[PDB]
Amino acid sequence: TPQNITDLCAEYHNTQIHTLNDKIFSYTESLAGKDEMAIITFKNGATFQVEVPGSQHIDSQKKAIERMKDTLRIAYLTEAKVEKLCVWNNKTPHAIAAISMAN
Amino acid sequence: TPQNITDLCAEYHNTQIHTLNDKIFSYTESLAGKDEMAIITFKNGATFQVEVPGSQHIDSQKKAIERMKDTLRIAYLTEAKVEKLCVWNNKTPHAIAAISMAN
Amino acid sequence: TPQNITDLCAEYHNTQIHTLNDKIFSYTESLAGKDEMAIITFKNGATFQVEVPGSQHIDSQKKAIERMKDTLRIAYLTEAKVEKLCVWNNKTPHAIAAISMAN
Amino acid sequence: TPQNITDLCAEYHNTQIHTLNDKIFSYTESLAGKDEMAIITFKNGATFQVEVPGSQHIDSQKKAIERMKDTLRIAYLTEAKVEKLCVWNNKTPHAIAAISMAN
Amino acid sequence: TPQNITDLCAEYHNTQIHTLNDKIFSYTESLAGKDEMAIITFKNGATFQVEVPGSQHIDSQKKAIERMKDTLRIAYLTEAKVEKLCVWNNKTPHAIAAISMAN
């Protein structure tokens, strides 16, 4: 199994790593339908989203996606420092595939 | 995909942004019949609610409503500054469609 | 729609508002069969309980009841000042129907 | 309904109240199959457990059991003072039936 | 029956207890399909993971798995000291079986 975020991020297509080593700057949640979306930004301006559960989301991928939203909401409120983000760049804002937080 | 709440907001009907830049002043929760609701108010007098889960709402929308209540509860408790709120102005208290928090 | 716990409490059957403006003094949780219950008391001796999840009431009513127990546990742990409680008087200890928190 | 934990602990067979008035010293979680367990200890050496949600547990029972493990984890992590524990003294360690926390 | 992470760890196969007595150094969460994994690291470099679901793990095993992920997440966010880890040494990185936390 991959030991970290980088080697984990190289296993998929259309993914790229971003080293933020910074705390989330803003958190946006929308419950307005078809856009069950969470959007975060950092101070430099970089925006990322947690992609809405469309049909390309199994039922094992719905749970992991909800978890990701929880992780971001709490990482935001606790001001936790996010290290790197492995993101799908074929979408805009870049959809988050993985996250690592390090003190 | 909208990069923020202002855009995310203008995407629906009867929606309206509301800048707050204030923490939630009060949080009310009620489990009394068909009105399982949460009400939040700010120091300036503004009172918003999270709609009641029912009829129109399917599945992904029924649990986004649950996440929204969780988000408001932990935001009230942690005294997080809510920047803006996209609210459905056709309801009273104005229902919440989206929220953004910053820093 | 009522815009606060007092008004909201006025729409139901034999409910009563108790103003506390204090934090919860103790929280008791019991998983002992049939009487799955949560009890809270304030330093002033007042005692309240969240009603146990009957099947005869809808499932959204069971999710509300579960949320309420989370809210009380987290309110107790963080020492949130509870403003008012809207409870049903036809029970003993009195069953909570709504709660407001504010500083 | 019982209004305190000592009353309540008395409605059952083979129960026994312990007063700790102390925080949880350690917390042990395990997912190693059929042994889905939580184990808490206090400085005085006492050890308690939350029973595995077996396939003889009623509907609500499994869910109250999940709640009790969430409570112990959060109590441990926040160093919340545990007042008394109502345990069944016929298991090793004593299975927890109810918990009370007071400042 | 067993009362601590050690006894409990010695009742399964391919398990070894790891004494860490330190806080988790980094936390990595991944929602990228079939790689829905949680990987933690400690200061010395030691890496562990929580085994992704599947039909090998009964639904109750899926739940202890989800619970273990939440525990790892708040422990990291709160900087709780993790004492010992009981891990399956037959995989790489070693898969976590039980965790003990002690202040």
Curated annotation (Swiss-Prot), chains A, B, C, D, E:
One of its GO terms (molecular function) is host cell surface binding. Coiled coil: none annotated. Changing residue 57 to A: Loss of toxicity. One of its GO terms (cellular component) is catalytic complex. GO terms for biological process: positive regulation of tyrosine phosphorylation of STAT protein. Keywords: Disulfide bond, Enterotoxin, Host cell membrane, Host membrane, Membrane, Secreted, Signal, Toxin, Virulence. It is found in: Secreted; Host cell membrane. It comes from the Bacteria. Disulfide bonds join 9-86. The holotoxin (choleragen) consists of a pentameric ring of B subunits whose central pore is occupied by the A subunit. The A subunit contains two chains, A1 and A2, linked by a disulfide bridge. The B subunit pentameric ring directs the A subunit to its target by binding to the GM1 gangliosides present on the surface of the intestinal epithelial cells. It can bind five GM1 gangliosides. It has no toxic activity by itself. This is Cholera enterotoxin subunit B. It comes from Vibrio cholerae serotype O1 (strain ATCC 39315 / El Tor Inaba N16961). The chain holds residues 22 to 124 of 124 of the full protein.
